[PDB]
Design an enzyme around this catalytic site. Structure first.
Site, PDB file in Angstrom:
ATOM      1  N   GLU A  65      -0.662  -0.396   2.894  1.00  0.00           N
ATOM      2  CA  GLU A  65      -0.522  -0.588   4.400  1.00  0.00           C
ATOM      3  C   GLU A  65       0.502   0.399   5.139  1.00  0.00           C
ATOM      4  OE1 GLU A  65      -0.378  -2.593   1.888  1.00  0.00           O
ATOM      5  OE2 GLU A  65       1.304  -4.402   2.618  1.00  0.00           O
ATOM      6  N   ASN A  66       1.321   1.086   4.226  1.00  0.00           N
ATOM      7  CA  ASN A  66       2.322   1.920   4.765  1.00  0.00           C
ATOM      8  C   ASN A  66       1.548   3.414   4.992  1.00  0.00           C
ATOM      9  OD1 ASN A  66       2.282   1.846   1.896  1.00  0.00           O
ATOM     10  ND2 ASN A  66       3.882   3.582   1.933  1.00  0.00           N
TER      11      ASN A  66
END
Ligand SMILES: [K+]
Ligand SMILES: [K+]
Ligand SMILES: [K+]
Ligand SMILES: [K+]
Ligand SMILES: [K+]
Ligand SMILES: [K+]
Ligand SMILES: [K+]
Ligand SMILES: [K+]
EC number: 2.8.3.5
Lengths: 468, 463, 463, 468
Positions: C287-288
């Site tokens: 998700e980063n």
């Protein structure tokens, strides 16, 4: 409307855990017989939506004594020690709900409105969440109230409150005709009327059943359409909680507060000093006192023979009304108050902030009896809010300060503060302005007793006192 | 309360462009003297918040005739030729608002509530916006209505409606005592009561001023705190404004049950009440503020203060009650009426209803129709001829006409069939007129329907 | 773009009390030079909008150490002792915001969108408000979080979130050309890219300034229009921050399918990926801002710019891509990831999930968990030990712990059972560990469940 | 990503009535082969979400010719006569949608955002409803657009727009690697990129398929996760719609408009005068031109050998970019524009009102080609909006007036008006102020040619002209 001759038959089907709206303001207009019937059915874990907690062994208090209530949704729950005991002990859940909000949420629950906005409670624990609903033995908070959404309309903040509906409503009324139309007597109407519209099953107990045609059609307070079950109450004690009867430094605050009255003014006076101030009103001045339990036109305390349990003021004292008075329901009373129809709200306070925030309903872990109608009474920008209080606390601890440290009743809602030393006008943006100074004291004396700065009026005068 | 002896003095300071709340339902409870006073002051460009438009030369119609109204915020505006002309000509703005919504918005306006939610109007042009409020000369649209936000509560959709406040309210009332407390007579209460609480300056005209103490305190309909200016009206006119179908009526008559509270629309539903058995007790609610409607009056009992929602003079039965418009719609929106029976132009498969707007440039408004079908708790029965002129379907997959409500109809009675309606399953044919077959119904119905295995010949009241 | 040679000069005018957006995910992509410059300017009372809190003495942690931050608006704040101390002591305000929401709010803030709706956080404390943002000395609550409005769209509930704009943004980037166009390296992009568009003054520090023309125009990640001030950072530390279970891992491993896009939480889900067959292609989304996660790097391949969501140094596989945090969560919120597999503290009968907050005065934040389960389209599989320490149920009628999402879990894998979850029907036991019986499951599950008629012994990957 | 060798196989399952997003800005970045495949499948009644209508027999125009489109959701549909014919004839439904709103709604449809607020279209037919979606043979409106909700945030009005998602997206891209990652070339990116994220099934056609590892991971414009179906386009015409090539009274407006440029400024210049004005920019002045189709750094028209169909300006003319230019998608372009990042928006207008309302996108029953990005370009209070137009219309009919009579592009959005006679500063509350007056004309001359009053600057100067 289905008529019953036995109160128990009328309520035998309330399920455990039901939400039950219970009418009454103090012990005024409480459904004594229906409450007595619930004691016999033994129904448990109720969520009782009841403005107050009755008193220790009366009204809702009877159901608290029997431990039949799981949670109360109420605005003021003082004067019931068993209540306080259970609350503080974590045995009872309580949602302290502003009285007007309670009345309006109940009305909404009967009127098809799932939610509405109100400025009552904005800027307080009601909006913010964190009001204790359930305590832990040690005085910590086990269940905290949840925040209410805020939305701005027309430049002002309001919070979203949801309808309250009950599975049953236990309503006290005065008379019912044979068709089930119902009327309420004097101030005993209060929450009974809106509660009659907000439950799946409404049960009304009345003092007398009269013939159809007894009421003018225009004067039926609650049309039969709302009365599902009707029982004539077997007996009524009509206990008077506080008997107040008239015969036949604080005085300084009172005499200055008395100068806030104007002819033709509508005022709502909080218990204590504000109400005492009304005693000094000029006989030549007509002031209409509004009582949040649903009265307009309060008069003096009753002569002994005028005492009537159905007529009490918001402080639960027996009262009288003056000619041309009117009674109305709690939802109407708070529509009147929230709509700014009352010109002056005068009440005591624990603290007031520089810009007019007011704290006057709670002392964490010390005073937890609810806000009653206080939050509603200061909710209108149209209503002048005058705080009357001793200038300083105990160790000369400040009461007027930069920011209140006690839970707020409202934010930037106070317009004038009257103490025994000074009178301050309050502006929500510019702060305090000392406009009257008690003789003998200096502006510096006030500075020493005030926790924030203040402008000094260029026209500062000696503090006035009513001449009566 | 400040008392006036001259109505003009009481309203001379209304600003041009003011928003003025004007009481009355039809010609019932209209402030005829205050309106006559505005004719004298000549104030212009008013935004009149008025449930209806009076009639051509009476009530609000006088102010339309004199062109003193810029915009009307109303729920039903029929029966006014000058109103039609100005609206079609682009000389008048008309903002239609459901009647219950109008009442609740006004009440909110005096109650410190800036906005609240209501089911009424969800799924209609009220929520969508887009109605012509004002036309241009060429007939194009100058101003269209604005949408309303939608939000769900406990599984149902509602729309957000905002408070209405006025600069002034012109309120008609029955009596005022010398303190300024006021009462309203019969169904003339309607919007007068809430409008008295929702304007900066309330002006009330009454038929009679009585001594303080004349009213029981419990029975003051409007406490004096709400009455800023009071005048005794100088003149009160007491103006009174006012087989296929038979089969539907006789079947509709069978929807009544003893002890039922019902609201019957003009036309077939009301006619059906004529067939209620003397042995059955049915309380008819009228949205203009009455519970306990009785038959039409003999001529010498006609009372201008007592009309039904179709503005017909009526009577009430023993034990009837009167209440204000905001209370009436709290009663209706709250599901307290058990049965709402009304006519319809179209009904969809899952129960959407179209019954208030016939297309055409002219608008009449939805009146209380959107509120009446707004509650899941109230049974809504539509009584209508099965198919339209020409034989186009009236019952179809989706209505093509403007909706009064979505998934709000529970039963449809036509001269051919009775259908139960379910918002998820659709239609179930439960009764069938003699001589017709299920296929005849299929051919005259624009959507599919289940056939009840207990389908019976269509019933007819015996009365 | 105005170029600076001294970082202090670029940030000397940030006002006390300013809201400053600070890029970085963990220690990846943090503006270490700009933060060091704020240490020199001494600006105080900042509202730092920063996804994380760096670590004790690095990244945002430096500004916490120097007490220059009044409030943090972040999604996950673990691994910082001074942050814990200040928060518990009431010296720091912490406003937790879901990570995807933070990214989208910042993007909105630079896109002219004042507010938008998201499923993320619906039904949690994010929507309800009430989280302790600030404590008083006595440990009582000084400031609680505010609720978010809820509105339904196409049958689903969403909450309204508002744009975040800052007075300044301190952005770390890889290279800037001489015109001020900037690019970001690997996963260091994260919040830097959207934060560059959402503040009145964007200050970017880069590792290298290159000639104009060094970038393909198509590949400028942040066009110069968004870059107001640019400095080449003076120093870059490249700081790197970083059987019951086996049975669950081996069963979780069977949730992978060829060609699947999955986002695997720290712990068991990620460990399960170790069992994916070399014959199966699974694209792991981080998700980063990464798509195509590969195995952990050998030590000499560790790269501070490349970490997974648990801040572990990682590698990527061929064909991987990098993207910003707002894009990553548009990818996640849009249901583009096929499978989200994560651990949980509790799962309710209809699939509510509690997996981000263990009660206690300390808060760590939800990170991207609320976004990861926000889409109906993404299959959410919870992998967890069946019962809690003590044997209290983890699967129950309703969670008692704070929700990450409501009705968002589709399958639960424990060491005892595999349950399919349906938001309307509840649980269906579909696999059962050898040696256990359905009754053993009933005894260790706090709600009822259907038993699949095709219940099989719990499967285990063969890898 | 599933790779196909035949475009028809990639789209054979699109159902009749499907909503299909189709990439492209003008004929730049259009999925020629996928559109050609739809012609062969014959799928009908499509709702095509396509920024433009291609041209008569190309791009979406091919599907209009074949009558395969039921409704278009587009921002600008000029240059396609068949389109206009069907639209005016009531054979085609068209939702004219602000370009930025179209891009942002598509992005929302791929990003899990069901709705969002934007000020684009506030105060216009987009917000108000009434934009014609379907006409009747006689030119009357058969289906009118519905209003959008308005809500105020931070003192400004915004309207609520909903996500657009499609059943399929037909996307044109430059290259795909073997894993399905995709890149776009120059300005051909536009709507292709966000459309790739907003459909149940995305079909991308590319010019070249390259090896995995061909792209830097950081520079993959569209990660494979979004590319469901990929086909290498069989052939590409890359038709150039408008070939603009450089060699090797209106002039008055242009020369004054040229003085609105400042060094370091980011500007977006509308077709015509504003763009011509850029020609007079000082070589010593650096001005970055933003193109709403996704370019920052527009340069002059191409020399013949620099012509590239993938690089066109918003007016669809072949263009070049200057050093340090960048390309980006349509949703990013409008985030850049709506977020007020562009310092100056200069465009032509049909009318401007006293307080700055602008009308420049529609003439009922005459000009109905859509607003393109006009509504977005004037949506930001941060961006200076300068209108450049001839002072008066035909019969000296007023163009600057009390209120526009044509549909608005925006309300109170214009900051300066430059005509051949005057330059007016516009304030949304105080109105117009004449600040420059062409020599020869008098303030009274302006009064005669202006339909509203205006203040005269105390420092009124002769109208300036760029010296280049
Ligand atoms: K006040
Ligand atoms: K206030
Ligand atoms: K119903
Ligand atoms: K409904
Ligand atoms: K899911
Ligand atoms: K969910
Ligand atoms: K502007
Ligand atoms: K504007």
């Amino acid at each position: 409307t289905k008529f019953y001759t036995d109160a128990v038959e009328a309520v035998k089907d309330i399920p455990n855990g039901a939400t039950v709206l219970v009418g009454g303001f103090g012990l005024c207009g409480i459904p004594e017989n229906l409450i007595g019937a619930l004691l016999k059915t033994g129904v448990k874990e109720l969520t009782a939506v009841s403005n107050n907690a009755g008193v220790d062994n009366f009204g809702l208090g009877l159901l608290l004594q029997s431990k039949q209530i799981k949670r109360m949704i109420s605005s003021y729950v003082g004067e019931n020690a068993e209540f306080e005991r259970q609350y503080l002990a974590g045995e009872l859940e309580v949602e302290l709900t502003p009285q007007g909000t309670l009345a309006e949420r109940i009305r909404a629950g009967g009127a098809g409105v799932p939610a509405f906005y109100t400025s009552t409670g904005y800027g307080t624990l009601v909006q913010e969440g964190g009001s204790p609903i359930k305590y832990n033995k040690d005085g910590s908070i086990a269940i905290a109230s949840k925040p209410r959404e805020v939305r701005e309309f027309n430049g002002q903040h309001f919070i979203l409150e949801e309808a309250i509906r009950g599975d049953f409503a236990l309503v006290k009324a005065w008379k019912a005709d044979q068709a089930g139309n119902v009327t309420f007597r004097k101030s005993a109407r209060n929450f009974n009327l809106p509660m009659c519209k907000a439950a799946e099953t409404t049960v009304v107990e009345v003092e007398e059943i009269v013939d159809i045609g007894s009421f003018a059609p225009e004067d039926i307070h609650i049309p039969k359409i709302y009365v599902h079950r009707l029982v004539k109450g077997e007996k009524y004690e009509k206990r008077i909680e506080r008997l107040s009867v008239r015969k036949e430094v604080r005085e300084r605050i009172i005499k200055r507060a008395a100068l806030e009255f104007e002819d033709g003014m509508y005022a709502n006076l909080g218990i204590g000093i504000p109400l005492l101030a009304s005693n000094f009103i000029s006989p030549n001045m007509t002031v209409h006192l509004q009582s949040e339990n649903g009265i307009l036109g309060l008069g003096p305390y009753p002569l002994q023979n005028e005492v009537d349990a159905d007529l009490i003021n918001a402080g639960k004292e027996t009262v009288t009304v003056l000619p041309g008075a009117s009674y109305f329901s709690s939802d109407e009373s708070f529509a009147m108050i929230r709509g700014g129809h009352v010109n002056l709200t005068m009440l005591g306070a624990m603290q007031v902030s520089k810009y007019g925030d007011l704290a006057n309903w709670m002392i964490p872990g010390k005073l937890v009896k609810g806000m009653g109608g206080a939050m509603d009474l200061v909710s209108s920008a149209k209503t002048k809010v005058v705080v009357t209080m001793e200038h300083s606390a105990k160790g000369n601890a400040h009461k007027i300060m930069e920011k209140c440290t006690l839970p707020l009743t409202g934010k930037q809602c106070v317009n004038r503060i009257i103490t025994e030393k000074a009178v301050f006008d309050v502006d929500r943006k510019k702060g305090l302005t000392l406009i009257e100074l008690w003789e003998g004291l200096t502006v510096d004396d006030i500075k020493k007793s005030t926790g924030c700065d203040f402008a000094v009026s260029p026209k500062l005068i000696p503090m006035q006192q009513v001449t009566t």
